[PDB]
Ligand binder design. Structure first.
Ligand SMILES: *[C@H](CC(=O)N1CC(C)(C)C1)C(=O)NNC(=O)CCc1ccccc1C(=O)N[C@H](C)c1cc(-c2cnn(C)c2)cc(-c2ccn(CC)n2)c1
Ligand SMILES: [Cl-]
Ligand SMILES: [Cl-]
Ligand SMILES: [Cl-]
Ligand SMILES: [Cl-]
Ligand SMILES: [Cl-]
Ligand SMILES: [Zn+2]
Ligand SMILES: [Zn+2]
Ligand SMILES: [Zn+2]
Ligand SMILES: [Zn+2]
Ligand SMILES: [Zn+2]
Length: 313
């Protein structure tokens, strides 16, 4: 007894296969998945006639197709993606304040905050898998996007997470080649040194939440023994992410794009998303609250940008 099915790694290039109904899928295809569900140790049923299956890349054609779609050669990626997708497809993705959020489940507070942020900054992903899922996420079908985010970050469903580390991984898979940042550090003793950063390092900074303060100057130890001052010289990027350890901060409407609120201890806390629309909105998964002012524990703030040059001589 034999049925005919499709195997794929990208759900674009399908490959017809013949499968013996007396052997498990793993004995003929290796690890095999159906809509994220592991069917490796399952004998083929009759309802599987014509359906499409994801398989781990076992030959060169599937390896090339897998990279062109996911931009990774890690053999385990597809499995971690499918294993995460089996859960994220059960989450609810309500529209909250014109954005796609996530109803709370499996400790996804940080994923919801990252998803809401990604929808408010200008970003193009290099892997076609990410870009396709990015689009479907804006339309409300964010399951594949969240599953891919977990896979690219080497995190699993249930694990707690950091929003800044998550954003950092995603930027590494985004087209930020045009982004440039020139910095200058003035040291009374040693002197002046001007560096330029490209890529992800041009849009992320750890230290202060204020973009204005970064323009004026921040205090940084010099390699000589004096506390030097660093300031921003040029910034060519569509946005900037300013992160700092959680501290009480005042967000003023219209001066920022969005922000991450963190309440709790290191590696054990709750995330909330603050966005600046006509007023200030706070999105906590499926819950929404509005207020004209906001003071609270903020760890990330996102600002819009295009081209900046300093007036400090
Ligand atoms: C969400 C949990 C969830 O879904 N819920 C709802 C519930 C209440 C029922 C539980 C979730 O996933 N939360 N994430 C975490 O709990 C883990 C956070 C984490 C993970 C890995 C690395 C770092 C962090 C983390 O704690 N990040 C925050 C932003 C943080 C906090 C501090 C901090 C807090 N208090 N102190 C004294 C320090 C510090 C830092 C930080 C980053 C870098 N540095 C030094 C340069 N400090 C980050
Ligand atoms: Cl790549
Ligand atoms: Cl669940
Ligand atoms: Cl990439
Ligand atoms: Cl207004
Ligand atoms: Cl802004
Ligand atoms: Zn790539
Ligand atoms: Zn589940
Ligand atoms: Zn010095
Ligand atoms: Zn206002
Ligand atoms: Zn929550």
């Amino acid at each position: 007894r034999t049925i005919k099915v499709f195997t794929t790694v990208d759900n674009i290039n399908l490959h017809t296969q013949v499968v013996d109904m007396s052997m498990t899928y793993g004995q003929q295809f290796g690890p095999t998945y159906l809509d994220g569900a592991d069917v490796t140790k399952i004998k083929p049923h009759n309802s599987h006639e014509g359906k499409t299956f994801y398989v781990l890349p076992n030959d060169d054609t599937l390896r090339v197709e897998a990279f062109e779609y996911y931009h990774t050669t890690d053999p385990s990626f597809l499995g971690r993606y499918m294993s995460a997708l089996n859960h994220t497809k059960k989450w609810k993705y309500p529209q909250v304040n014109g954005l796609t959020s996530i109803k709370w489940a499996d400790n996804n507070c940080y994923l919801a905050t990252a998803l809401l942020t990604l929808q408010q900054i200008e970003l193009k992903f290099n892997p076609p898998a990410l870009q396709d899922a990015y689009y479907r996420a804006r339309a409300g079908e964010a399951a594949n996007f969240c599953a891919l985010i977990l896979a690219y970050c080497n995190k699993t469903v249930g694990e707690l997470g950091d929003v800044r580390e998550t954003m950092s991984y995603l930027f590494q898979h985004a087209n930020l080649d045009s982004c440039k940042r020139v910095l200058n550090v003035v040291c009374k003793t040693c002197g002046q040194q001007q560096t330029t950063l490209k890529g992800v390092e041009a849009v992320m900074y750890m230290g202060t939440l204020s973009y204005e303060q970064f323009k004026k100057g921040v205090q940084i130890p010099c390699t000589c023994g004096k506390q030097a001052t660093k300031y921003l010289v040029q910034q060519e990027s569509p946005f900037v992410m300013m992160s700092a350890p959680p501290a009480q901060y005042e967000l003023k409407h219209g001066t920022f794009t969005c922000a991450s609120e963190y309440t709790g201890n290191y590696q054990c806390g709750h995330y909330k998303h603050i966005t600046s629309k006509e007023t200030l909105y706070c999105i906590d998964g499926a819950l929404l609250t509005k207020s004209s002012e906001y003071k609270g524990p903020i760890t990330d703030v996102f600002y819009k940008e295009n081209s900046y040059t300093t007036t400090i001589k």
